[PDB]
């Protein structure tokens, strides 16, 4: 309860269609403050929408209380989708996880494909008439 | 006077003279001949391993009278045979013929120690376990 938020070292970034700042949080008698709650409170303070708010890298001070981090307010939501890495959007629920096998499986697959000159159809038919 | 040249252009004579006479110092001569690499039983290593060939008792030198328990050891790296003291009361019964021992120096960098003549090494481990552990019953002899 009674979570105070402050910003310092503010940079406006038209180049990335956003605004950059460092977040300072005062939360007595509470472990820390969730990133989604911080995002909503920031959206409320700056009357912006939540899906255009970014928070990352939060570090509680020694003993407790004061925490710090970084904040990004994109001037829209399409700009958020366009200048935001996939993992942060996955954290926010905005984007889905790209589906793929383990890295070793992908590499083994790639090294099997280098064995074939042409298409898979020709190799499959040649193997078929090669066996039976 | 002083028997050494003092001329300001005599650096060659001074440096060569020092180089010649440094051969009279044992440590310099040993490290430039490479005697540890060529003639030391351990080949310059701090420790070495070997197979026990036999148990031997060595008479302590005067004015002491005792039997210092030692083992004759054949080293693995070079096949050399050395004698190592097995230090503590009853620790000879822990080592047996054909066992593998770890040897270390005996404290005086290639010299014998105390009243034990001709012994320059000591047993540290037998069968992969230290003698200090076995003597104190902190471990067990493997089998």
């Amino acid at each position: 309860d009674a979570v105070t938020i402050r910003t310092r070292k503010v940079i406006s970034n038209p180049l990335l269609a956003r605004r950059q700042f460092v977040i300072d949080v005062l939360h007595p008698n509470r472990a820390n403050v969730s990133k989604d709650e911080l995002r909503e409170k920031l959206a409320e303070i700056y009357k912006a929408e939540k899906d255009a708010v970014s928070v990352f890298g939060f570090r509680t001070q020694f003993g407790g209380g004061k925490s710090t981090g970084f904040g990004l307010i994109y001037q829209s939501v399409a700009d958020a989708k366009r200048f935001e890495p996939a993992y942060r959007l996955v954290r926010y629920g905005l984007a889905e996880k790209v589906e793929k096998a383990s890295r070793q499986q992908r590499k083994q697959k790639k090294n099997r494909d280098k064995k074939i000159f042409g298409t898979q159809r020709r190799a499959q038919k040649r193997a078929a008439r090669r066996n039976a | 006077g002083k028997g050494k040249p003092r001329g300001l252009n005599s650096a060659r004579k001074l440096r060569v003279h020092r180089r010649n006479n440094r051969w009279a110092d044992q440590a310099y001569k040993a490290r430039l001949l490479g005697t540890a690499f060529k003639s030391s039983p351990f080949g310059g290593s701090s420790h070495a391993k070997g197979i026990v060939l036999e148990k031997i008792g060595i008479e302590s030198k005067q004015p002491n009278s005792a039997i210092r328990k030692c083992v004759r050891v054949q080293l693995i790296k070079n096949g050399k045979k050395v004698t190592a003291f097995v230090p503590n009361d009853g620790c000879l019964n822990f080592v047996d013929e054909n066992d593998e021992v770890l040897l270390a120096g005996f404290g005086r960098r290639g010299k014998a120690k105390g009243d034990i003549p001709g012994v320059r090494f000591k047993v540290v481990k037998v069968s992969g376990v230290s003698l200090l552990a076995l003597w104190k019953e902190k471990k067990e002899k493997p089998r």
């Binding site: - | 008792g57 039997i67 009361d89 009853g90 019964n93």
Partner: protein
């Protein structure tokens, strides 16, 4: 009056075994330094320059 390899471990093997006596633990760290300081420089036992740290009970 000779020794032999057969006599190895004589005195230790024939030493009468005595178990440790159960005693309280000794404080560790700063408490031990406190204790030694109190022994030597607080509760003094000096008498005309006789300050044995380990006198024999007698």
């Amino acid at each position: 009056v000779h020794g032999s390899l057969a006599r190895a471990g004589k005195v230790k093997s024939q030493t009468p075994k005595v178990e440790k006596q159960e005693k309280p633990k000794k404080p560790q760290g700063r408490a031990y330094m406190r204790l030694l300081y109190t022994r030597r420089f607080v509760n003094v036992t000096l008498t005309n320059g006789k300050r044995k740290m380990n006198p024999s009970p007698a």
